[PDB]
Ligand binder design. Structure first.
Ligand SMILES: Nc1nc2c(ncn2[C@@H]2O[C@H](COP(=O)(O)OP(=O)(O)NP(=O)(O)O)[C@@H](O)[C@H]2O)c(=O)[nH]1
Ligand SMILES: [Mg+2]
Length: 632
């Protein structure tokens, strides 16, 4: 174990770019030494390359636009960004890129599919400059083109490589062929010129015409990469097994260890925000980031250790839940087998066996360690509903729309992870003026007399105040044995209101009068009496509809910046602010959830596919008269 030799990485790309085949070839090359039909299912997979441990953190999720991604991004240290060489940086690659600096994560690029017709390194470079404002450094040059792509020039070390087959079984270092020498020389000088910006010493040699050392140049490019200022570009063909080992070399060379990235923050008991340094002999602090029901050992919990050491066969403490846990065994997942380990130290990742109450996002500490918390406990709201009848916001409930069960969540595509219904907004209903009404069920039904009679007062309560019920009955006017029945009825009717059928929310109900019959009264009669009363009260109380208003962040290139604002205002929005993020602009806005349906598509049609958005429930508000009348 040595912290400097760890490379915690994620591979990021468009859906067609080659993330999976680049991953699997990586696992191939890394596992040849010493060491059924599946798509690699393991949140973190460990492997070895030139005396370094590479932990590949997978981010499957789904549509990868979710806020779930930031956990994946906080658990890894660096990224390889994979471009498809025919296209340059792609609309989503532009968003995928936009996520990475949104999280201060050092990245290298991999210009993939260099074998495919259209493949052009230069189109990748120029578009990274123009669209992403990236400052790419040309680290490699291709030998041949498309179908003739056969070799790669390393312009840092001025070496070339040629590939005999497409199988990854024949690699040979070769001299830079003569017709690429001028270009190679020219791009070497450019790379020295970049490196000179990060090392005074190198600038001087550049001016004097002295060649710097491999070590210096690698260091200077490493500095700039980690400092987020440059992006070394590498190229190849994962499918035709060319460029992959040189990519792995670049992971070691330029990507950060856990010491190279600023440390994670924690909230202590006393409430302060403290930094936590990767010290293995410090107290234990770990974060769970995915749970898997694997067959062989049952519930697995994957963790990243930030400080201290997690030991097999000991007790830990879950600070997010306030609970003892027994770590029965610790495991690592390799490409073909699982390994039982005695411990897991700071800066490392693995899986734990035997945990019971630990969910993803939860903090684990040593038994006598400081009780710190790493991820804000915020528990979001249930704003969308889906009738899916043919705990992390896949909540399941049963109420109105008899014989239909619902899956409530938030974020159109974001709640859609379990998903035969269509997405509906969670409207509420309330009154705007106090009323005073009666409920009366006086009937001959079911072999006997039935009689219930309640009078209630109903007021609206400040927005968000909830429900209040008061019983102001005097001298058994309604017999005491029946009050629970009438409460029960009031509650039942408040589940479905008068305008559109949704729960009633911010009202105060006061039961103040009524009457009964000495033989004919019963619990059933007073239940219905109360239910009748509240229905009438909500109709008479000049009722209004409350919709949820979302907080929205849209990131868009400046040229479309006028067209998006136009569109947001057409969606009954209010434009709150606008602060830049790279050569992009982020527009914050309030907008109704009713107006955000299929927004991902309109934004991409008004933005040439390069803009994206995130969304959060903020508050309930009334619909204007127009929208209410129309909501029928
Ligand atoms: N010509 C060529 N095709 C490639 C290369 N790498 C991948 N492909 C092809 O491109 C397609 C996408 O592969 P894949 O690894 O699934 O990409 P992905 O980004 O993982 N897909 P997704 O994210 O949707 O699961 C496949 O047909 C794959 O074989 C390459 O280097 N050259
Ligand atoms: Mg894939």
């Amino acid at each position: 174990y040595d912290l400097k030799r760890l490379r915690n990485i994620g591979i990021a790309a468009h859906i067609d770019a080659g993330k999976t085949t680049t991953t699997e070839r990586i696992l191939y090359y890394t596992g040849r030494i010493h060491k059924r039909g599946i798509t690699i299912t393991a949140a973190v997979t460990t492997c070895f390359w030139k005396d370094h441990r590479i932990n590949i953190i997978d981010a499957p999720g789904h549509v990868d636009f979710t806020i779930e991604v930031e956990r994946s991004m906080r658990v890894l240290d660096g990224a390889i960004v994979v471009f498809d060489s025919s296209q340059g940086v792609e609309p989503q690659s532009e968003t995928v890129w936009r996520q990475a600096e949104k999280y201060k994560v050092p990245r290298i690029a991999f210009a993939n599919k260099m074998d495919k017709t259209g493949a052009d390194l230069w189109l990748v470079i120029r578009t990274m400059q123009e669209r992403l404002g990236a400052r790419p450094v040309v680290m490699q040059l291709p030998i041949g083109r498309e179908d003739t792509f056969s070799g790669i020039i390393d312009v840092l070390r001025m070496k070339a490589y040629t590939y005999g087959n497409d199988l990854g079984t024949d690699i040979r270092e070769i001299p830079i062929p003569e017709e690429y020498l001028d270009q190679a020389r020219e791009y070497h000088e450019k790379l020295v010129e970049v490196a000179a910006d990060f090392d005074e010493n190198i600038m001087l040699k550049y001016l004097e015409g002295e060649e710097p050392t491999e070590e210096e140049l690698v260091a200077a490019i490493r500095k700039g990469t980690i400092d987020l200022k440059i992006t070394p570009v590498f190229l190849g063909s994962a499918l035709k097994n060319k460029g992959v080992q040189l990519l792995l070399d670049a992971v070691v060379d330029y990507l950060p260890s856990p010491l190279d990235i600023p440390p994670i923050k924690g909230t202590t008991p006393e409430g302060e925000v403290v930094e936590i340094h990767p010290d293995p002999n410090g107290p234990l602090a770990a974060l769970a980031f995915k749970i898997m029901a694997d067959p062989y050992v049952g519930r697995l919990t994957f963790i990243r250790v930030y400080s201290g050491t997690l030991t097999s066969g000991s007790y830990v403490y879950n600070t997010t839940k306030g609970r003892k846990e027994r770590v029965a065994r610790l495991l690592r997942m390799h490409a073909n087998h699982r390994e039982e380990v005695e411990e897991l130290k700071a800066g490392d990742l693995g899986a734990v066996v035997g945990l019971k109450e630990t969910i993803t996002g939860d903090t684990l500490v040593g038994e006598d360690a400081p009780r710190v918390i790493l991820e804000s406990i915020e528990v979001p709201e249930p704003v969308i509903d889906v009738a899916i009848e043919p705990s992390p916001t896949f909540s399941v409930s049963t109420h109105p729309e008899t014989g239909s069960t619902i899956i409530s969540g938030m974020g159109e595509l974001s709640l859609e992870i379990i998903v035969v219904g269509k997405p509906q907004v969670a409207y509420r209903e309330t009154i705007t003026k106090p009323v005073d009404v009666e409920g009366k069920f006086i009937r001959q039904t079911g072999g006997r007399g039935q009689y219930g009679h309640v009078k209630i007062k109903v007021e609206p309560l400040p927005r968000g105040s909830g429900f209040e019920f008061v019983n102001a009955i005097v001298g058994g006017v309604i017999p005491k044995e029946y009050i629970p029945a009438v409460q029960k009825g009031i509650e039942e009717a408040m589940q479905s209101g008068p305008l559109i059928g949704f729960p009633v929310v911010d009202i105060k109900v006061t039961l103040y009068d009524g009457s009964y019959h000495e033989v004919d009264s019963s619990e059933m009669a007073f239940k219905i009496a109360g239910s009748m009363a509240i229905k009438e009260a909500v109709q008479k109380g000049d009722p209004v509809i409350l919709e949820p208003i979302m907080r929205v962040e849209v990131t868009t290139p400046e040229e479309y910046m006028g067209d998006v604002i136009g569109d947001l205002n057409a969606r009954r929005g209010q434009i709150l602010g606008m602060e830049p993020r790279g050569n992009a602009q982020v527009i914050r806005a309030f907008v109704p959830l009713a107006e955000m349906f299929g927004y991902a598509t309109d934004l991409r049609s008004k933005t040439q596919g390069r803009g994206s958005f995130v969304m959060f429930f903020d508050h309930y508000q009334e619909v204007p008269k127009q929208v209410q009348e129309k909501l029928i």
